[PDB]
Design a protein around this ligand. Structure first.
Ligand code: NAD
Ligand code: NAD
Ligand code: NAD
Ligand code: NAD
Lengths: 294, 294, 294, 294
């Protein structure tokens, strides 16, 4: 039970921390020294390199930003050559299914049991150890992996074989974008026609218009004091990241010749938002398209 | 406690029936004799006319299909002249806010305490007495009215003053259209990329993509055996009616200069569906835009 | 050949002026005194009222902003009662077809030969006498009317019977909104991928992407020095007015159960623009949604 | 002046034929023997291979279906290694800019002067030698290349440096999709509100709604007897190919973080069309989304 952890960013750091607090030994690596230092103070050893970290490890976990970086790091010279014997590889970044199926197959072509296990939840849930994993790959691996997932998270869904994790993640987050936008526009329509935001919200929440966002993440400021909207959209899940996910969803749709009118429109709208300088705001900042007075 | 009930259609009939089973005396009227006859056998007296029905009544309730009909019936000669003294008027049709604010004001201009109380739920909920009412108007009236609402329904929300009911209803149903379409496209994207429908569904339901439709009304056939989708989209809430509601939502948005990119797109898509001959199918038949093999 | 002219706004004033410069006697009226005064100095008599203006007239022409005002002014007390015997009525405002068919029928119900003759072109074309008329009604009337249309305009299309004018206008302007937005997004895509605006423009203009906007009204600043875009979107055809027209198009679509995914989306986008404070800018200001650096 | 021609499909065959009829010697190759045979009968020699064809050639021209195939054929073993000394390479397929910039750079890394020169026009224009080329690369190459372009085409635009051709093409065809859909929906709106198709068409063509499609490619059957629509959408430019182009446009937009609400919506709609079995119909078959009676 010795782990290599590569990628200690907004999600990487707290996930790696919860693994330490669970009793695992970690070799961490990250392009950014202050991130390695964070985990070293919490009781991990820094590895000189991804390669180094991996040399000696039972399981290798990566949490990096996108497709490029992940394929880069696993795909020759690439660390995946240098990797290991009977080691469990857990690829938890959110990347394009194609990109994950490719990496999986190279895992196969080396006996390595790998899983794509993208995460849903946020920085707040990464810290609390309550994240949701969506996993492609063998039940074989999964069960070997479960004890780790349980340390970093709560709901563990087996979504299918190589790539299924990414597929479910992409599908889920696209629908999220849609209901969030749908929620922001509905919110602003009622308010503009005379309704009190909080009243309108509760009605739709308890009704057929009900959805995740209205439950826990209202885009309208004041409705939920605890939400990004009530603090001018700071923190939370970046608009820029949501756009990326939507981008991955487009990629999947084109492969399957799928039609995604709402998702694609949502994407178009998030890009507008990025034009308006909101890339680093919470994705609910999409509310600003409908309300000026903000 | 003598009621005039005008409009005994898919929703009207069971609502009027549950009022009888609650111990109210009703005078019912409907352009269609077999509908009056239904309620007469269950123990109501038929009224020769809307006017007749109303003559003698404490409260007048109407459940008609659209704006036209409702304004027609209340708006001169129109029955609203012939109406009553201290009688409670309950307008439960789903109509345009403008149209409801107009009628309210004429109620005012005659001392009549009126409420707009559109219903959410369906034929199944109208029968079970579990409907949701969304009410504009005075708390004054509302409390007088509550005992009736409780007989026909469960959740009773006071949404605001004259017209607020219609506003909340329109807002709610537009978001519904959006999440349902968003749900159908997401469902079909995952399936096309190799996922099992039922698996994908549960994941998104328990996750940030979660919504009313995934909870209780999955558009994908087989996922929920109890749903319209599992019986080729028969019964339920008509696609044609959803289009109407979306139409009312557009109306509200134009008055308030509101932007509704998702709702308007949803509308565009429902009209396509009507072109394909699906007007009388359940609104989840929207799933057919994404899946051919059906 | 004595004319009553009611409505002397951005379009009304120059149209009425070109009628005077053609040798017609006018009785003008407008809620705004400085507008009547403009036409009085150019050689028209002010009428105390719409009614007054009309009393004595061979033909009555109106150029008002919307449906409300036009129905208001013609529809009882309403001036249409007070009107005339064998007088030609020319309704050149852009209003909803329904609204125009209603007015036409009241014209019928009084022997008055009326035409709906909405105008396409702008302030610049109203001044030059080069406007395009799109006419519903009888060939009978039309030919009687032609000499006036020729004085105020160039292309005169007979679009059909009562209401056809408005229908063609609405259809035309909706497609305009679409190609203009389509032009602005394409412009900004090429530029962002390294192309020179002017080069990209000429290519698409001469090619299958070619359209009115690229011919004469490029939304990209610098491409055409003569265009609103090259002068920060001042003057021209207001964004607010385009939104109104799109609104009328929605109205027509709902009556005919027509699907308008592009038009409706265009509408959604124009409303966003109005939220950003651009109501009084030229409709090509839609370019600002795609380009920040502006 | 000896040419290697690789790819003799719908566009490849007639382009290669017009080069022969211009007095060039060709070595042709194609995975499909009947296509090589076509060009052999018209006076070309078949090459055993892409490689063979190229060995001996002054200029190498390729006209293949997509990104995959083109990168495949040029990108190692890949034919681009085996290629040539001071030979002119003309890559006329429509592929993703990224994909073209990559290939260009490998051309550089071997002294080979290459151009991306995607074609606009159709099978009919490929045959007539009237195609439009949109070219990225050096003026240097271009002028060397011009005499060939003139043999296969008419308008030759220099769109910029490496990749610009593809960029302009993608931008142009996305706007095309938009105006075509915009044209089909407008057509069907007017007809549904009582207008004669042909009348409505001419009005919008001569007016601000005017565009390429209305000029030469009306999607409404009967309007132009010469058009795909008048012969049930057979022949012309495939719906499936248009979807591909839209896909490439999405790719470019994501790289530049560009917003393309109309293009993306157009894409969503074309995919629906493919679901309905129309992949091999002319792209104007999009008209069928708005008109059932067809
Ligand atoms: N942040 C969120 O709220 C959120 C929530 C759920 C899922 N996700 C998904 O998770 C993924 C990662 O999210 P994040 O916010 O942690 O990203 P992040 O940018 O905050 O962290 C990525 C880390 O990876 C490191 N890294 C990059 N390249 C590396 C290399 N080749 N070798 C070693 N380390 C390298 C960086 O130093 C950085 O610290 C994304 O794909 C995202 O969509 C994000
Ligand atoms: N049906 C549903 O699943 C559903 C669910 C929730 C809300 N709604 C809303 O409720 C409203 C009514 O729904 P419904 O399904 O009962 O409509 P319906 O068509 O089934 O019934 C309307 C009834 O009104 C009667 N009627 C029409 N004109 C009349 C007149 N002027 N005088 C007396 N009676 C007249 C008709 O005879 C008919 O029986 C709609 O506005 C709808 O959007 C419908
Ligand atoms: N302005 C344009 O560039 C443009 C171009 C083509 C078509 N149109 C269409 O033409 C119509 C009018 O355009 P406009 O720009 O001249 O509007 P406008 O607002 O500039 O002028 C309308 C005039 O009507 C007068 N008016 C309003 N109510 C009146 C009343 N009841 N009695 C007498 N006069 C009254 C007002 O005083 C005003 O001067 C609109 O429907 C518009 O969509 C506008
Ligand atoms: N067809 C049109 O109406 C049209 C119009 C303008 C532009 N375009 C663009 O032009 C491109 C090609 O169009 P097309 O219709 O000629 O395609 P096509 O499918 O008709 O022809 C492609 C040809 O390339 C050959 N080919 C495929 N792989 C090969 C290989 N590796 N080696 C040698 N030959 C190979 C095939 O045998 C085929 O004959 C597309 O990218 C398209 O978007 C098409």
């Amino acid at each position: 039970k010795q782990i290599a952890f590569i990628g200690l960013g907004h999600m990487g750091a707290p996930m790696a921390t919860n693994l330490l607090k669970a009793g695992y030994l970690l070799n961490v690596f990250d392009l950014v020294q202050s991130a390695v230092d964070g985990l070293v103070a919490a009781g991990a050893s820094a590895a000189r390199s991804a390669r180094d970290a991996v040399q000696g490890a039972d399981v290798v976990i990566s949490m990096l930003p996108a497709s490029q970086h992940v394929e880069g790091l696993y795909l020759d010279d690439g660390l995946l050559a240098h990797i290991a014997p009977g080691t469990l590889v857990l690829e938890c970044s959110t990347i394009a299914p194609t990109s994950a199926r490719k990496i999986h197959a190279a895992a196969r072509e080396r006996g390595l049991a790998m899983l794509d296990a993208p995460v849903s939840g946020g920085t707040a849930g990464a810290a609390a150890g309550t994240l949701t994993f969506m996993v492609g790959g063998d039940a074989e691996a999964l069960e070997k992996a479960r004890p780790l997932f349980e340390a970093m998270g709560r709901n563990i869904f087996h979504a299918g074989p190589d790539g299924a994790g990414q597929v479910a993640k992409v599908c889920n987050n696209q629908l999220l974008a849609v209901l969030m936008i749908g929620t922001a526009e509905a919110m602003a329509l009622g308010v503009a026609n005379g309704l009190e935001a909080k009243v309108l919200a509760e009605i739709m929440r308890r009704s057929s218009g009900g959805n995740w966002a209205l439950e826990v993440y209202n885009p309208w400021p004041g409705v939920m004091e605890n939400a990004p909207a009530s603090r001018d959209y700071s923190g939370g899940f970046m608009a820029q990241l949501m756009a990326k996910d939507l981008g991955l969803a487009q990629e999947a749709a084109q492969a399957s010749a799928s039609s995604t009118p709402m998702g694609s429109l949502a994407l178009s709208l998030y890009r507008l938002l990025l034009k308006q300088g909101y890339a680093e705001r919470d994705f609910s900042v999409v509310q600003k398209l409908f309300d000026p007075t903000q």
